[PDB]
Amino acid sequence: VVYKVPEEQPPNTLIGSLAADLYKLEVGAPYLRVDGKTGDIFTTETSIDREGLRECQNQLPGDPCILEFEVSITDLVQNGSPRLLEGQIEVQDINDNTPNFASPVITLAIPENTNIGSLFPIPLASDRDAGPNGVASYELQAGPEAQELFGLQVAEDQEEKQPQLIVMGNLDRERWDSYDLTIKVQDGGSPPRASSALLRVTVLDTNDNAPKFERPSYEAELSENSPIGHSVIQVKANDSDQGANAEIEYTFHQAPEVVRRLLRLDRNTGLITVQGPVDREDLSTLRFSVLAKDRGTNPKSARAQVVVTVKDMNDNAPTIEIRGIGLVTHQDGMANISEDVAEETAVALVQVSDRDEGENAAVTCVVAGDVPFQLRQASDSKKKYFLQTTTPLDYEKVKDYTIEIVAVDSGNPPLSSTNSLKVQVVDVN
Amino acid sequence: VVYKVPEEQPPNTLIGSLAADLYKLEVGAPYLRVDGKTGDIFTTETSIDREGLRECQNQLPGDPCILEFEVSITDLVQNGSPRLLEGQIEVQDINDNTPNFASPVITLAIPENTNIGSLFPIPLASDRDAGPNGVASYELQAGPEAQELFGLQVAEDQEEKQPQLIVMGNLDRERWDSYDLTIKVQDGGSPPRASSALLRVTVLDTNDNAPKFERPSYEAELSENSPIGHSVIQVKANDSDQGANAEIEYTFHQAPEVVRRLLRLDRNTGLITVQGPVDREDLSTLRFSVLAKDRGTNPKSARAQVVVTVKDMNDNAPTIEIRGIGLVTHQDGMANISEDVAEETAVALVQVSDRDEGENAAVTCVVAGDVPFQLRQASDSKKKYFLQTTTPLDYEKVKDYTIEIVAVDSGNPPLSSTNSLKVQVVDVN
Ligand SMILES: [Ca+2]
Ligand SMILES: [Ca+2]
Ligand SMILES: [Ca+2]
Ligand SMILES: [Ca+2]
Ligand SMILES: [Ca+2]
Ligand SMILES: [Ca+2]
Ligand SMILES: [Ca+2]
Ligand SMILES: [Ca+2]
Ligand SMILES: [Ca+2]
Ligand SMILES: [Ca+2]
Ligand SMILES: [Ca+2]
Ligand SMILES: [Ca+2]
Ligand SMILES: [Ca+2]
Ligand SMILES: [Ca+2]
Ligand SMILES: [Ca+2]
Ligand SMILES: [Ca+2]
Ligand SMILES: [Ca+2]
Ligand SMILES: [Ca+2]
Ligand SMILES: [Ca+2]
Ligand SMILES: [Ca+2]
Ligand SMILES: [Ca+2]
Ligand SMILES: [Ca+2]
């Protein structure tokens, strides 16, 4: 028959004697002792430990822990052969075990901007005791700031208490990214046993920030004809997110072929260098946008206008255009003017121009040898001149006039150009 | 002096005559014609196109487009040498160009759950005309559903109109992930010219969904001693997100060494196979959780309890334990019982047990040769027997009793065990 006895009781505690009937202990050997003539049965210097017994290991909750034993009634005035009695001692549980977390530091990663109400599981504490003497409650201990951000809930759904962090306010990683709470587990023994763990919440990053350029808009001056590799400007943007969410790539946004041909933009450095032949005479300003884009899964981006002013070099010689006026008309660079026409009548029209700018296009223009023609301003960097006679002409020694015009810049080095006009005359009586 | 003339006017339009004073056209050659004796000046079969002229290419807004020309006054009763007049014709702009998007399909990616108010840039339309005859307005045309989700704003900040989509309601990719709007660009000419583009918004995924198991909880039966590779159960979770945000990895959540040793869980298939020697006698149930975790940047997850019931095989032979009772006591497997002791006095206590379950542990037990001992039930799968004498004993032909006990299962195949006891007697007068 049965016997209810608390575990871990001190040696020689009476567990009972026979409500039935030499009494000898055949089975139960380390844990029990019997006395003969009485049938009374006590604990020993090996204590019955409800969590220690082999028999009571993987038991489902509510199944008693039963230690089995046999004693043999072996006297009846030395008459009978023995009768044995197969007893059962049901070991009662005392609260001799503390509830424990697997690790004393517990580490939760909660994303930024997680919706209020969101639940996150906390590792279960466990307790080797049974029923009421096992896990009873979880308690969240937090600083004022954190008290308002994190709650604690327990789900009794699994029929085993699963504790959960509730997020209750907005988390922002860029404001604050680590919270220290304590989680305390207590059992339902009297007195209770209790255990604590450090519960860190780390706020995981989300890509909730776009790059921003250091300046809204960028300018730079760049010399025409700069060598390949010449540094033009460096753009830079910043991003307040973490890792790849703040890693940035620079690419041309709106940028026509003409610009892409001349300028190279490094994805990583945002440094713009020369890559082709810059020519103020083809393009005097490079206008384009740069795109700064993060390496988030759904990248965010920003755009910046850049204006590169192209600066003049004196790389163009002046042009001398020699054409007719009124009735006097050139053919294949020669002109028919008849002997005996008024002094300072105009034989040709001379236009002078320079494709460069400022000084580099400021042109002086003048006539070569000893020939009886000069230039008169007719109308800077485009000058129009009458090419007119200095003297009267007779067919004396003439039809041999090659007039040679020379023009020069104010560049450095200065550039020169020359063009000529043949005038054939006609004799008059 | 100047002259204001609209572009693309029909040949022979009068652009004026001399408020000043043979008149001859020296410069301006394809586009203008003059008549002599009058000084009156008209357009030709080559039309002045304000967007076509070389002179008027990369002009900043508000700088007139000036076509330059020269005519020479070359008669004064055939007295003077010629005077030239360097004229300027300022070409007025008409609205002869339509505003255009670079592509007629424009493609915006807006993330799911983007905060209401968020702005997203729409590519600029451009228009080769000038001032009021260029881009005036942008218009967003959308279906009822979309009208409420997307607004349109223009920023006049850059001093060039930058249009922007405003998100005005929640987008959910899992509800709907493609919207067709039309964007219409109109200029400020009378009549206006206008152009449209298809503006697709595609709603980009965010990892806003956690995996869910097909079942909350899983059971399976598994035979003890199953071969390596035997399929146990397959767990499966689903995730309503896109690509990696719904790609799932299965790993043990809470799972003790003992289980991890026996069971293998494929990260990709969620199939659990046998990997070690399952032994109902060591562990009769495998209890563990499985974690399903997505491959999002900040993974979300779900847990499922699994219970594997381990099923018995008859892989254990019965045990025969032979021990003393009362005063009769065994030493080194032999026992001292004296000749002349009552018929059916008990020489030993025989306990029989089988580590298996049900039939596989149901034990029949019996005595071997012709020896004057039998077994009596003393007290299934643990049976206790008195080993008692059948006859009286005299030292006639004795001290030579080797009693052999045999026990068998009800398994398949059945298993057998044997143990023996020597009894030495003592002669009495
Ligand atoms: Ca204990
Ligand atoms: Ca406890
Ligand atoms: Ca206990
Ligand atoms: Ca943030
Ligand atoms: Ca921190
Ligand atoms: Ca970012
Ligand atoms: Ca962030
Ligand atoms: Ca040049
Ligand atoms: Ca020059
Ligand atoms: Ca130059
Ligand atoms: Ca002559
Ligand atoms: Ca036009
Ligand atoms: Ca227009
Ligand atoms: Ca126009
Ligand atoms: Ca969604
Ligand atoms: Ca779609
Ligand atoms: Ca997901
Ligand atoms: Ca989603
Ligand atoms: Ca086994
Ligand atoms: Ca068996
Ligand atoms: Ca078995
Ligand atoms: Ca005898």
Residue numbers in the entry:
A (entry chain A), B (entry chain A): 3 to 23, 32 to 389, 394 to 443
From the article:
Protocadherin-1 (PCDH1) is a non-clustered δ1 protocadherin involved in respiratory diseases. PCDH1 has seven EC repeats (labeled EC1 to EC7 from N to C-terminus), a single pass transmembrane domain and a cytoplasmic domain with the three conserved motifs (CM1–CM3) typical of the δ1 subgroup. PCDH1 may bind bronchial epithelial cells and epithelial cells of the airway mucosa together by mediating homophilic adhesion and helping in forming the epithelial barrier. Here we use bead aggregation assays to show that repeats EC1 to EC4 form the minimal adhesive unit for human (Homo sapiens [hs]) PCDH1, despite its longer extracellular domain with seven EC repeats.
There are three calcium ions in each complete linker region (EC1–EC2, EC2–EC3, and EC3–EC4) and one calcium ion at the end of EC4. Calcium ions at complete linker regions are coordinated by highly conserved canonical calcium-binding motifs XEXBASE, DXD, DRE/DYE, XDXTOP and DXNDN. An additional calcium ion near the EC2–EC3 linker is unique, it is at a crystal contact, and it might be present due to purification and crystallization conditions with high calcium. Both interface areas are greater than 856 Å2, an empirical cut-off to distinguish biological interfaces from crystal contacts.
